[PDB]
Amino acid sequence: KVFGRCELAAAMKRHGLDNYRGYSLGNWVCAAKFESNFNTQATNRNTDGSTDYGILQINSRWWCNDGRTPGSRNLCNIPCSALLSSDITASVNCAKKIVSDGNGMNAWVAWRNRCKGTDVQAWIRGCRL
Ligand SMILES: [N]
Ligand SMILES: [N]
Ligand SMILES: [N]
Ligand SMILES: [N]
Ligand SMILES: [Pt+2]
Ligand SMILES: [Pt+2]
Ligand SMILES: [Pt+2]
Ligand SMILES: [Pt+2]
């Protein structure tokens, strides 16, 4: 499922991400856009042999089990295939853990390189919260 810009903001605000650890909604919407293009089914194999899964491209090295990442933690206790659901719940609850683990949204390279320090307000422009 490829969400719309305003559609994903709503599901995101609802599952409790707006101001989560002091990151406003636009930051999460911007990260989704540059990670997955809002596609819940997005996967990207990394040179390291891990894979990033879903709307927030959560990585198999640390966070989820895809049964093929050689040496790999499963912090979030889920198979990576539950990050590809059209319901973003599982992606969201894993994202709260990730963002809580010290580095905040720097965990998402696409956030640090493209969203950090820009007007992320514009990403929720014309959406009903
Ligand atoms: N939720
Ligand atoms: N998109
Ligand atoms: N999906
Ligand atoms: N969702
Ligand atoms: Pt789908
Ligand atoms: Pt939902
Ligand atoms: Pt939720
Ligand atoms: Pt777009």
UniProtKB/Swiss-Prot annotation:
Pfam families: Lys. Residues 1-129 form the C-type lysozyme domain. Its EC number is 3.2.1.17. One of its GO terms (molecular function) is beta-N-acetylglucosaminidase activity. GO terms for biological process: cell wall macromolecule catabolic process; defense response to bacterium; defense response to Gram-negative bacterium; defense response to Gram-positive bacterium; killing of cells of another organism. Keywords: Allergen, Antimicrobial, Bacteriolytic enzyme, Disulfide bond, Glycosidase, Hydrolase, Secreted, Signal. Substrate binds at residue 101. The keyword Ribonucleoprotein does not apply. SMART domains: LYZ1. It is found in: Secreted. In the egg white and polymorphonuclear leukocytes. SUPFAM superfamilies: Lysozyme-like. It catalyses: Hydrolysis of (1->4)-beta-linkages between N-acetylmuramic acid and N-acetyl-D-glucosamine residues in a peptidoglycan and between N-acetyl-D-glucosamine residues in chitodextrins. The active site is at 35, 52. The keyword Repeat does not apply. Disulfide bonds join 6-127, 30-115, 64-80, 76-94. GO terms for cellular component: cytoplasm; endoplasmic reticulum; extracellular space. Belongs to the glycosyl hydrolase 22 family. Lysozymes have primarily a bacteriolytic function; those in tissues and body fluids are associated with the monocyte-macrophage system and enhance the activity of immunoagents. Has bacteriolytic activity against M.luteus. Monomer. Lysozyme C is capable of both hydrolysis and transglycosylation; it also shows a slight esterase activity. It acts rapidly on both peptide-substituted and unsubstituted peptidoglycan, and slowly on chitin oligosaccharides. This is Lysozyme C. It comes from Gallus gallus (Chicken).
